[PDB]
Design a protein around this ligand. Structure first.
Ligand SMILES: [K+]
Ligand SMILES: [K+]
Ligand SMILES: [K+]
Ligand SMILES: [Mg+2]
Ligand SMILES: [Mg+2]
Ligand SMILES: [Mg+2]
Lengths: 76, 97, 120, 191, 81
RNA sequence: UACCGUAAGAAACAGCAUCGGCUAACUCCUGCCAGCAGCGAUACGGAGGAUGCGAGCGUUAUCCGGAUUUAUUGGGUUUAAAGGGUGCGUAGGUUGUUCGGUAAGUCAGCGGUGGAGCGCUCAACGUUCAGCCUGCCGUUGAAACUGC
RNA sequence: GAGAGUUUGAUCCUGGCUCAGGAUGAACGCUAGCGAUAGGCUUAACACAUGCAAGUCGAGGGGCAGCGGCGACCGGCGCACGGGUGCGUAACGCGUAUGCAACUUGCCUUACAGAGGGGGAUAACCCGCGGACUAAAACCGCAUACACUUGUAUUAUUGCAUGAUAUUACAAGGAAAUAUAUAGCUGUAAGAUAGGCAUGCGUCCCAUUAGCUUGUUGGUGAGGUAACGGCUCACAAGGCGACGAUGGGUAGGGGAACUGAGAGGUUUAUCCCCCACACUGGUACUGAGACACGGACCAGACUCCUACGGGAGGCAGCAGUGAGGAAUAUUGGUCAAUGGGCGAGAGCCUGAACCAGCCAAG
């Protein structure tokens, strides 16, 4: 029972932050303005890095996402 | 973790142990990385030991069990304290005692 | 054949058949005496006691009854081992005496272990 | 197991006095049975003669034979048979016959190198000491066989009566062992 | 001071596919049972950045990481046409 | 390890007409036995002796060798089984002689990798070192033969 | 490194058959004294009841109703190992030998840096499956790190194509645990250990199994992954096959072991390495790591109990019992030794393992 309760609570906790980050990248992926992208990037990168160092996702996954978004904003 | 332990390789009523370096998850008499000696508690206890390899593994960080730690305390394998260059350069000789 | 013929085709080795196929690679089987009857040899002219038995391995065979004097009857559970009789076509199995329903030969003083008789 | 049966029957079967001296060796000397040969028969007679004269059963005899083959094979099989605790005790004269020597060894009466060994098949290597137990040096039966007889006809035993011990100098050659056994027949049979 | 990868010398067998070729490597080896020497051939898939290889060419190819579903080799040289 | 008082508590099973080691008498003259020559008795059943093995002895079942009874080492096809009814020909297998190249087969070197003791009172068995790694891979050379 | 019999009235060949030998996790008949050392459901991934088999930390926290320590709860680590089974699987599954300039790696060792400041719920408790306050080494921001990630460079050096290793910079972003000297906590790097992917060669029969494939083959781009890749998603058309594709049947694979002078062969009984599995399927979740062996959810058998509103089990862990069968044992003792898990240690747990009991029993 203890294992079941811990797994359910941790599953909900991980789902919260993973879904928030996924929605953040989805919203960022429709941006067009360069200055808007520049001022929206750092908080999204911070959230992704916090997730990666928090073990919800992997460090290589966060690095890949950050590289993709930086290479996108480097080309308007 | 990597360990230094003894596998019971003998006969019923006559325990003969092999000193090996093996993962902690491996079975007792199963897989090992390197054989570093033998051990027989029936005599009055004959110990075979590879000094250089035992020093190398205790240096890279293999954790020995209690009995293997006693076996390494004998034959002077735990002289890493003296070999750590503790404000000196010579080598003492405590094996004669 | 030539070396290339052997390379292309090769050699084929057959499999030797088992002399007791109804046992299914077992030393002994258990059966029930479906029928108990008598047969005539193929230059002997005797009256050999045989039983048709349906073994537990879904097979029916004929088993000779060695010795003199059998207490068996129809619908009797018997132990069947290999071994054939030369002058009798058909039968290729024996019934172990002294096991299950089959009793040992009475009045036997020699070759006792082959007929299931205890020491007197 | 052991034979523990009638010995004169085997003596009269084989003709030779394997067990020793008896009146039946000269009176009524013929193979036993109220009713009393191929090369198989003679080979079997030779092998059984060796087995009965040395108290060895079939599996031990076969082990001795192929051990001798691994390490003339028939020549050293005979010295392997001779190098036995009971046989060495009997040849030292401390016991009358080979059965008596076997019983003495099996009981706590014989030591090898100062330690009591009671296995009456223990191979004795050269340069070893076999001696009577120090607690059994004063038995009524233990002394009449050695003292008085004093044969000492074998040039590979040292006796040393002053210590009641004995030593095997070396394995005797096939010519100096007084056994009427044709090892060629046995090695041909087992080959 | 690196490690070495596998190298295969062969003959081009197909180039109809874009940016990739097929290389045939043939050798004679002893039969295990009868000891005769028989011919064997193997086909490799190689990656070439230009369709510069025609049907039949002594070439050398080198092992690589998976570049496609079945593409683990790359062209290195052309011995002859 | 030591002390009393006693051989005292401890031997079966198979087969003896040939192959094979081991033979008199009584039964039966169907009952029976068998791995074969077969007997229905120096072969069936018992009694006496004999011969094997021996805490085992026999029966059945399974797998190897003798078997060359799949034959590369190491078999054959007139008459014992075994040449296609006869040709042409595709793939494949084989290739007269000689002069040079190459190094795929082949050969060689160098690396990597995978009996003697001791202790069981003896032995099975434990254990150590001398001893094969002769399989695979890498790297250097040789050119008589096969291939190109 | 060998033979014997057997077709004839009698020969010499050919050829099958039968004995003689060696070995069984064998069974049966007769008969049985001891010791040592091995082995013990080979039949069905058959059904049953009971008990045990994975817990530990009061040097993490709120409590003590219990005399110091601890029932219970929150929290850390472990239960993916040890142990069991051979269903499935002709496959980079396995064996052998390599590559990753396409990889990940808790616990362990070493080196370099740092541990500064705050706030929410909530379990238990209390009050009646509902209501309110609670603490952190539980949870989540802020400050700092340019040793790390990302992006843009310069100086290079050097490869096996895509490139790799270092320096010198700017920018952004990412941590902590303290407790009573010890035990520790965080980031980075190296090592060690363990996994993952891809390769050359080897890997059972059937042609009374001849064509197979339509993300199937390749290219461009994107997404996804620890990572390359039709892994997935939006032009050309291909690829693989008589050196056996495809389809069907049967097997877990090796070292061992047995057995042949050799050639070899047979078989995986004990033992060791790899793979697959946990009543049957599907999906995941938590985790450094999952086919999740004493964890879920759903769908299917089957079985058991209720009190008809509702719930439970999978015996391929160790032992009883029943059935199947020719046939294979105790509902035993101890953690004393070896090995594991947790713990600062003492220590606790361990049907692994050490032992003992039973069995013509090798
Ligand atoms: K000691
Ligand atoms: K973990
Ligand atoms: K323990
Ligand atoms: Mg014995
Ligand atoms: Mg003909
Ligand atoms: Mg013709």
């Amino acid at each position: 029972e203890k294992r079941i309760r811990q797994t359910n609570a941790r599953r909900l906790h991980n789902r919260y932050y993973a879904r928030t980050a996924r929605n953040a990248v989805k919203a960022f992926r429709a941006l067009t303005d360069r200055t808007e992208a520049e001022k929206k990037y750092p908080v999204l990168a911070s959230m992704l890095d916090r997730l990666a160092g928090k073990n919800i996702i992997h460090k290589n996954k966060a690095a890949n996402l950050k590289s993709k978004l930086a290479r996108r904003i480097n080309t308007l | 973790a990597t360990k230094i332990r003894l596998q019971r390789h003998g006969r019923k009523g006559y325990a003969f142990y092999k000193i090996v370096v093996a993962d902690s998850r491996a079975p007792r008499d199963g897989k090992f990385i390197e054989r570093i000696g033998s051990y027989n508690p029936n005599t009055n206890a004959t110990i075979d030991l590879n000094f250089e390899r035992a020093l190398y593994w205790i240096g890279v960080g293999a954790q020995p069990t209690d009995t293997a730690r006693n076996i390494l305390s004998r034959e002077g394998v735990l002289m890493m304290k003296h070999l750590l260059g503790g404000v000196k350069k010579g080598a003492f000789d405590q094996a004669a005692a | 054949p030539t070396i290339q013929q052997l390379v292309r085709k090769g050699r084929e080795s057959f499999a030797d058949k088992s002399k007791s196929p109804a046992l299914n690679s077992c030393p002994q089987r258990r059966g029930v005496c479906v029928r108990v009857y008598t047969t005539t040899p193929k230059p002997n002219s005797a009256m050999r006691k045989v039983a048709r038995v349906r073994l537990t391995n879904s097979k029916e065979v004929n088993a000779y009854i060695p010795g003199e004097g059998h207490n068996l009857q129809e619908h009797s559970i018997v132990l069947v081992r290999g071994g054939r009789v030369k002058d009798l076509p058909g039968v290729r199995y024996h019934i172990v005496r002294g096991t299950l329903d089959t009793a040992g030969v009475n009045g036997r003083t020699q070759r006792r272990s082959k007929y299931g008789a205890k020491r007197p | 197991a052991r034979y523990t049966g009638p010995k004169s029957k085997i003596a009269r079967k084989f003709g030779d006095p394997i067990f020793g001296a008896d009146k039946v060796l000269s009176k009524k000397n013929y193979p036993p049975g109220q009713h009393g040969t191929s090369e198989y028969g003679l080979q079997l007679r030779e092998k059984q003669k060796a087995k009965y004269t040395y108290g060895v059963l079939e599996k031990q005899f076969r082990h001795l034979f192929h051990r001798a083959q691994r390490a003339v094979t028939g020549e050293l099989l005979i010295q392997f048979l001779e190098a036995r605790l009971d046989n060495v005790v009997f040849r030292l004269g401390i016991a009358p016959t080979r059965s008596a020597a076997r019983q003495l060894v099996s009981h706590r009466h014989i030591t090898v190198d100062g330690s009591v060994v009671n296995i009456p098949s223990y191979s004795v290597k050269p340069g070893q000491v076999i001696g009577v137990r120090e607690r059994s040096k004063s038995l009524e039966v233990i002394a009449d066989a050695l003292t008085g007889f004093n044969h000492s006809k074998y040039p590979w035993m040292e006796w040393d009566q002053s210590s009641l011990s004995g030593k095997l100098l070396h394995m005797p050659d096939r010519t100096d062992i007084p056994e009427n056994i044709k090892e060629q027949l046995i090695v041909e049979l087992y080959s | 001071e690196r490690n070495l990868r596998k190298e295969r010398v062969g003959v081009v067998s197909s180039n109809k596919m874009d940016k990739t070729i097929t290389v045939a490597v043939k050798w004679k080896e002893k039969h295990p049972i009868y000891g005769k020497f028989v011919n064997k051939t193997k086909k490799y898939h190689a990656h070439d950045e230009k369709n510069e290889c025609g049907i039949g060419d002594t070439v050398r190819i080198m092992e690589t990481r998976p570049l496609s579903r079945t593409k683990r080799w790359r062209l290195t040289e052309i011995i002859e046409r």
